Each structure stands twice: as structure tokens, then as C-alpha cells.
Ligand binder design. Structure first.
Ligand SMILES: *[C@@H]1O[C@H](CO)[C@@H](O[C@@H]2O[C@H](CO)[C@@H](O[C@@H]3O[C@H](CO)[C@@H](O)[C@H](O[C@H]4O[C@H](CO)[C@@H](O)[C@H](O)[C@@H]4O)[C@@H]3O)[C@H](O)[C@H]2NC(C)=O)[C@H](O)[C@H]1NC(C)=O
Ligand SMILES: *[C@@H]1O[C@H](CO)[C@@H](O[C@@H]2O[C@H](CO)[C@@H](O[C@@H]3O[C@H](CO)[C@@H](O)[C@H](O[C@H]4O[C@H](CO)[C@@H](O)[C@H](O)[C@@H]4O)[C@@H]3O)[C@H](O)[C@H]2NC(C)=O)[C@H](O)[C@H]1NC(C)=O
Ligand SMILES: *[C@@H]1O[C@H](CO)[C@@H](O[C@@H]2O[C@H](CO)[C@@H](O)[C@H](O)[C@H]2NC(C)=O)[C@H](O)[C@H]1NC(C)=O
Ligand SMILES: *[C@@H]1O[C@H](CO)[C@@H](O[C@@H]2O[C@H](CO)[C@@H](O)[C@H](O)[C@H]2NC(C)=O)[C@H](O)[C@H]1NC(C)=O
Ligand SMILES: *[C@@H]1O[C@H](CO)[C@@H](O[C@@H]2O[C@H](CO)[C@@H](O)[C@H](O)[C@H]2NC(C)=O)[C@H](O)[C@H]1NC(C)=O
Ligand SMILES: *[C@@H]1O[C@H](CO)[C@@H](O)[C@H](O)[C@H]1NC(C)=O
Lengths: 154, 51, 51
């Protein structure tokens, strides 16, 4: 839903970001791609964290973040769509991923879709973008067994 | 029917004509300015469900 | 006879409300005269008690 997110961000009027220290365990963070070139080296999106496997192991994640402040918080996360099963095994060590991002008032569950797509900048893969809103007194729970592009803040 | 080109669909819905219904074989490669759908329109092919 | 709804449950941890980390999704269907309601389930079904 591109128009909805564009309207939300346009009506908000700010791009202020606050870094939060999520507790990801037993993974490899700060992924890089050849298409996203920063300066002369490979890079990625600055506000989005790419989590791959470490030592051919991708432990399941269960991360919580409470809202102890007095305003709403917008989290932008994503889901990876590998082209082939070999790519999925080489990036996340499992065959199928499941992502569940939930609050006390909402839940979004997503399953990645493996398949070939036309190459943009020599990449046959895609990334779907989702967002969540956390109100005061609420709690954000991210439970993903794979294919998760994590938020780096709010 | 003089000023505007009018296509009459009897026993044939527009989606059935687009898909190729057995009764919709006369609407192939046809143009119109107003497609008139009738209340007797029905389907006589494999059941389908457009989301 | 005019509509279909297929649902697959999602398993994951949600914040506890009254000490429950599981949820329930609610759906509805409408049956017109002459139609038939068919329910085919293998699990995770919250059945209706009437209409
Ligand atoms: C399913 O079908 C799709 C569509 O046909 C198919 O995607 C194609 O894959 C090939 C794999 O080689 C792509 O070719 C590459 O594309 C880019 C742009 O040209 C370059 O990175 C590559 O050039 C290198 O390789 C050449 C061949 O050795 C060398 O001559 C050259 O110097 C470079 O080293 C290469 O041409 C092709 O672009 C896509 N086409 C698309 C996406 O439209 C896909 O592989 C098929 N199979 C699967 C399992 O998905
Ligand atoms: C994924 O992580 C989430 C947290 O982000 C986690 O949910 C938490 O689970 C714990 C353990 O079940 C819950 O704690 C319970 O909550 C209520 C309120 O306190 C009470 O029912 C429970 O009290 C019992 O336990 C106490 C400690 O032993 C005893 O003193 C007491 O007498 C009771 O026996 C207990 O504290 C917690 O509420 C949730 N938090 C949430 C949902 O925000 C979840 O379990 C993880 N998922 C996994 C591991 O699969
Ligand atoms: C639409 O279908 C009806 C119903 O079949 C057609 O009307 C007649 O149908 C009977 C069989 O029930 C045939 O024996 C007749 O020959 C049909 N009448 C004709 C061809 O004039 C009807 O023709 C079909 N088309 C339209 C435009 O209504
Ligand atoms: C949700 O988070 C939990 C907690 O980490 C995950 O549960 C683990 O799942 C793996 C893979 O099946 C098991 O090996 C572990 O023993 C589980 N941990 C337990 C039961 O404490 C769960 O997979 C995560 N993902 C989803 C989609 O629910
Ligand atoms: C739809 O209902 C039918 C009712 O029979 C289910 O068919 C049975 O499925 C089980 C599980 O695979 C088999 O062990 C049985 O042999 C099947 N019975 C037959 C073929 O008579 C079917 O699984 C249901 N499907 C869904 C999606 O709920
Ligand atoms: C990823 O980079 C951040 C800084 O952007 C750093 O704090 C963090 O430790 C890195 N994670 C690794 C190396 O696993």
C-alpha cells in the first residue's frame, strides 16, 4: 500500500528518527548489496537492518519493545523475497520464513514468496515494506523465524 | 443506436466475453461505446471467481 | 455457490491480553435463498452455532 504510507508520512511532516537497541541474538547484521553503493563501497538502506545467518544458523527471534513515552511511534520493517530456494537456504538457513509483528491492538503475519523476477540493477530479488504504529502504553513484538528486514529505530 | 456504437450482450457478461465463453464466441475482436448487460446473462463454462 | 473464503492460521507470539498469547480472527458469510453453505476444515475452526 504505497499511497497510504506516502500519505501518512506526508501528513506527519517530519523524518525525525530515534535509534533503539533491539536485542537480536545469534545473527549477522549490517548486510550489504552491490546495487546500493555508498561512496565507493557496498551498502544498504540506512534505516533498515538486513539480518542474515551466522555460521549457517539462523535462530528464531522474539524481540519486544515497550512504549514508555507520550507519543506514537512508527516502525518501518520489511520482508525479503529470495528468487530461488538455494538463495533462501544460503541467506536464512531455512526453507520458509514466517514473520509476525504484533501490538496489543493489531497483528500482521507475512510469508515470503520465492520466485524469479526481472533484474533491476542485477538483482532478481525484492523486498516488501510494511509499517506498524505503537501508541502510548502499547508494546511491539517482533517474532520472525526468517526473511526479516528489521527496524533500526522509530 | 445511431450516434453511439452499442454492443448488446445477451446470455453473455462482459467478463464471460473477455474470457471466451462458449456462448460468447460472437464478441471476439469487437469494439463499442456502451456495453449493455442483460438480466438473463448466465455462464456456461468452468466456474470462476474474480477476486 | 457464489463465493469462497480460504483461510490459513498464523502461528506466533502476540502480547498477552488477560494472560493469553493466542488470537482469534473473525469472518462472516452471507447465504441467499437457494444457496448452500459448505464448511470444509482440517483445523483451527471456530464454528458457527446458528444464523
Ligand atoms: C528465469 O527466466 C529469467 C528471464 O529469462 C532469467 O533471468 C535472466 O537470468 C540471466 C542469468 O545470466 C540474466 O543474465 C545476466 O543479466 C545481467 C544483465 O545482462 C548481467 O549481470 C549478466 O551478464 C553477465 O553474464 C554474461 C553471461 O555470462 C556475460 O556475458 C557478462 O559479461 C556478465 O558476466 C547476465 O547477462 C538475465 O538478465 C536475466 N533476465 C531477466 C531477469 O530478464 C532467470 O535466470 C531464469 N531462471 C531462474 C531460475 O530464475
Ligand atoms: C516472546 O517474548 C515475550 C515477551 O516479549 C514473551 O511474553 C511474555 O511471557 C511471559 C512468560 O509467560 C509473561 O509473563 C507472565 O505474565 C503475567 C503477568 O505477569 C502472568 O500471567 C505471569 O506470572 C506468572 O509467572 C510469575 C513468574 O514466575 C509468577 O510469579 C506468577 O505467580 C505467575 O505464575 C507471568 O509474569 C509475559 O506477560 C509475556 N509478556 C508479554 C506478552 O508482553 C513470550 O512468552 C515469548 N514467546 C515465546 C518464548 O515463545
Ligand atoms: C439465450 O439462451 C436462451 C435459452 O437457451 C435461448 O433461447 C432459446 O433457447 C432454447 C432452448 O431453451 C432454444 O431451443 C431456442 O432456439 C433459443 N431461441 C433462439 C435461438 O432464438 C436464447 O436464444 C439465447 N440468446 C439470447 C440472446 O437470449
Ligand atoms: C517465535 O519465537 C519463538 C521463541 O523463540 C520461536 O519458538 C522457537 O522455535 C524454534 C523453531 O521451531 C524451536 O526450535 C524453539 O525451541 C522454539 N522456542 C521455544 C519453544 O521456546 C518461534 O519459532 C518464533 N516464530 C514464530 C513464527 O512463532
Ligand atoms: C475437506 O473435507 C474432506 C472430507 O473428507 C477432507 O478429506 C479428507 O482429508 C483427510 C486429510 O487429508 C484424509 O485423510 C481423508 O481421507 C479425506 N477424506 C476423503 C478423501 O474422503 C479434506 O481434507 C478437507 N479439506 C480441507 C482443506 O479441509
Ligand atoms: C552493525 O553496525 C552498527 C553501527 O551501524 C554497530 O553498532 C553494530 O554492532 C553492527 N552489528 C554487527 C557488526 O553485528
Amino acid at each position: 500500500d504505497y499511497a497510504s504510507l506516502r500519505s501518512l508520512v506526508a501528513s506527519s511532516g517530519t523524518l525525525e528518527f530515534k535509534n533503539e537497541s533491539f536485542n537480536w541474538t545469534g545473527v549477522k547484521q549490517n548486510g550489504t548489496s552491490s546495487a546500493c553503493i555508498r561512496g565507493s563501497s557496498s551498502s544498504f538502506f540506512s534505516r533498515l537492518n538486513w539480518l542474515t545467518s551466522l555460521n549457517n544458523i539462523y535462530p528464531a527471534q522474539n524481540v519486544t519493545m515497550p512504549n514508555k513515552e507520550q507519543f506514537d511511534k512508527l516502525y518501518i520493517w520489511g520482508v525479503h523475497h529470495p528468487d530461488t530456494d538455494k538463495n533462501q537456504i544460503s541467506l536464512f538457513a531455512q526453507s520458509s520464513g514466517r514473520i509476525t509483528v504484533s501490538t496489543k491492538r493489531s497483528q500482521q503475519a507475512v510469508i515470503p514468496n520465492i520466485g524469479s523476477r526481472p533484474r533491476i540493477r542485477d538483482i532478481p530479488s525484492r523486498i516488501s515494506i510494511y509499517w506498524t504504529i505503537v501508541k502510548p502504553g502499547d508494546i511491539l513484538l517482533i517474532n520472525s523465524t526468517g526473511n526479516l528486514i528489521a527496524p533500526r529505530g522509530y | 443506436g445511431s450516434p453511439h456504437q452499442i454492443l448488446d450482450g445477451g446470455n453473455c457478461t462482459l467478463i464471460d466475453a473477455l474470457l471466451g465463453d462458449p456462448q460468447c464466441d460472437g464478441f471476439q475482436n469487437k469494439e463499442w461505446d456502451l456495453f449493455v448487460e442483460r438480466s438473463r446473462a448466465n455462464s456456461n463454462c468452468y466456474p470462476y471467481d474474480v477476486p
